[PDB]
A paper describes a structure:
While the template strand density of this type of structure appeared normal, the density of the product strand clearly indicated the presence of two sets of backbone phosphates. When a pre-translocation product RNA was modeled, strong positive density appeared between the modeled phosphates and continuous density was observed for an array of neighboring product bases. By modeling two alternate conformations of the product strand, this unusual density can be readily interpreted. Accordingly to the six-state nomenclature of the RdRP NAC suggested in our previous work with S6 representing translocation intermediates, we assign these two EC states as S6A and S6B. While both states share the same template model that is nearly identical to that in the previously reported S6 structure, the two product models differ in the extent of translocation with S6B leading S6A with an occupancy of 60% and 40%, respectively. Comparing to the S5 product RNA, the S6A product slightly moved toward the upstream as an entity, while the S6B product had the upstream nucleotides move by longer distances than the downstream nucleotides and is nearly identical to the previously reported S6 product.
Author numbering: 1 to 464
The structure:
RNA sequence: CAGGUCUC
RNA sequence: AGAGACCU
């Protein structure tokens, strides 16, 4: 992805978009009970912690574009994935607007507690002034769709969240691209049924883990991904995507039966306009974060990428022997013979992708079940039932989360959620966690899950 | 002050 | 009808 131009909002006729600049994060009652290094992200050009220019760091993720049109490998890769998806009989028919706005069994309703985006936000028009869960009306939405159209610019905001101490200094806070309500509705009308299919089928047919529940999905993964594992990290995956990958997505969508009207929306994702503050800018390539379908489309593109890297890097690859799941840019894959990602990453550089070792070393070392991570979680066989696999969120991440809060009124839920993640690291680690929690007065006032109850509830998901 | 998934 | 966890 690459910024094509920047213009003042006076020249483009767009309204200003500034957004909050003070974090909602505050040190919690546990801030000094646990060690951690993260702090609230830089949200302002004049944050005293900065050590470089903010805006430059902010937009550095747009590293440029390499290829614009698919080569032989990307074409083969897209067609192999599209063929695989065919066995799901995805309904390519337009979803009803009533269902696109208000949801189905497998598609959550549009979030009514968030902004409606351009231009509604600057006009003080909330989503609840157009949509109504009880009434399930679409007359008002249809009116505002035809009034304001589609391809409305995204509103850029800096994401208020914890960041490591290095990304505080380097200004590397994350951006979110607030979609317009209109575009969300139209994207959900067009691809709603694909979203349903994907949400209902996390695994190696979709090649996607969106919709997985790790408590039970982890036990399936060693069976879905037999053989030798390989994985790696992307730096700034979304923003690094060249236009070739959206062309490749078009190939996938057409081959599974999408009408030319449906497939023509991908260029609206490849080529987007954004309002940050008092300026409008154009982005060519790069997936917008904050668009309907971001997770799923990023995961679909990744399935194309892994396939194409393999058949371009190595001779004699059989794509039918690849196994993989992707959650956006996060990937865990298997193949009958070991795969050298040092070579995958060189090929990836040609495609404009920056890939680094999974263990965060400078060297690409073997990935196996004892060091693989996915959605930041490790894989740990149960001690009693070794076919049942614990997802292990590192205690270090749990410590970072517990040290801060955005609303201390919900401390008990926050801690309970972390306990639900933490017990998977075993009885000694869990008891040490609860006992540290209990070493301060708020901690003694909390209902904390008992470890034996946690383990028993988890076993009951499997009936064993 | 976005799009999602998961869980209480 | 709420909350928290997690991914972009
Ligand atoms: Zn443009």
């Amino acid at each position: 992805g690459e910024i094509q131009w920047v213009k003042p909002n006076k020249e483009t006729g767009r309204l200003n978009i500034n957004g909050p600049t003070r974090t909602k994060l505050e040190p919690s009652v546990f801030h000094d009970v646990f060690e951690g290094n993260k702090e609230p992200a830089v949200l302002h050009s004049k944050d005293p912690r900065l050590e470089v220019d903010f805006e430059q760091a902010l937009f550095s993720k747009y590293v440029g574009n390499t290829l614009y049109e698919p080569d032989e490998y990307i074409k083969e890769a897209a067609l192999h994935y599209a063929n695989q998806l065919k066995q799901l009989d995805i309904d390519t028919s337009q979803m009803s607007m009533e269902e696109a706005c208000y949801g189905t069994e497998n598609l959550e309703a549009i979030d009514l507690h968030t902004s409606a985006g351009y231009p509604y936000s600057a006009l003080g028009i909330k989503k609840r002034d157009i949509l109504d869960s009880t009434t399930r009306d679409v007359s008002k939405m249809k009116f505002y769709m035809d009034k304001y159209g589609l391809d409305l610019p995204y509103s850029t905001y800096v994401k208020d969240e914890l960041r490591s101490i290095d990304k505080i200094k380097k200004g590397k806070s994350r951006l979110i691209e607030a979609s317009s309500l209109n575009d969300s509705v139209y994207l959900r009308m067009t691809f709603g049924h694909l979203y349903e299919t994907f949400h209902a089928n996390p695994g190696t047919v979709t090649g996607s883990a969106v919709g997985c529940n790790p408590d039970t999905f982890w036990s399936k993964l060693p069976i879905l991904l037999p053989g030798s594992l390989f994985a790696f990290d992307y730096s700034g995956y979304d923003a690094s995507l060249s236009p070739v990958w959206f062309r490749a997505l078009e190939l996938v969508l057409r081959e599974i039966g999408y009408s030319e009207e449906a497939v023509s929306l991908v260029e609206g994702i490849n080529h987007t306009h954004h309002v940050y503050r008092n300026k409008t800018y154009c982005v060519l390539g790069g997936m917008p974060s904050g668009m309907s379908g971001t997770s799923i489309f990023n995961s679909m593109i990744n399935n194309i990428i892994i396939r194409a890297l393999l058949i371009k890097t190595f001779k004699g690859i059989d794509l039918d022997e690849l196994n993989m799941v992707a959650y956006g840019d996060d990937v865990l894959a298997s193949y009958p013979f070991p795969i050298d990602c040092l070579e995958l990453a060189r090929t990836g550089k040609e495609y404009g992708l920056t890939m680094t070792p999974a263990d965060k070393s400078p060297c690409f070392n073997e990935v196996n079940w004892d060091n693989a991570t996915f959605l930041k979680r490790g894989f740990l066989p149960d001690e009693q039932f070794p076919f049942l696999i614990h997802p292990t969120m590192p205690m270090k991440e749990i410590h970072e989360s517990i040290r801060w809060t955005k609303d201390a009124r919900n401390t008990q839920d926050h801690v309970r959620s972390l306990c639900l993640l933490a017990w998977h690291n075993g009885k000694q680690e869990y008891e040490k966690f609860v006992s540290a929690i209990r070493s301060v007065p708020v901690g003694k006032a909390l209902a904390i899950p008992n470890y034996e109850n946690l383990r028993r509830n988890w076993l009951e998901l499997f009936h064993h």
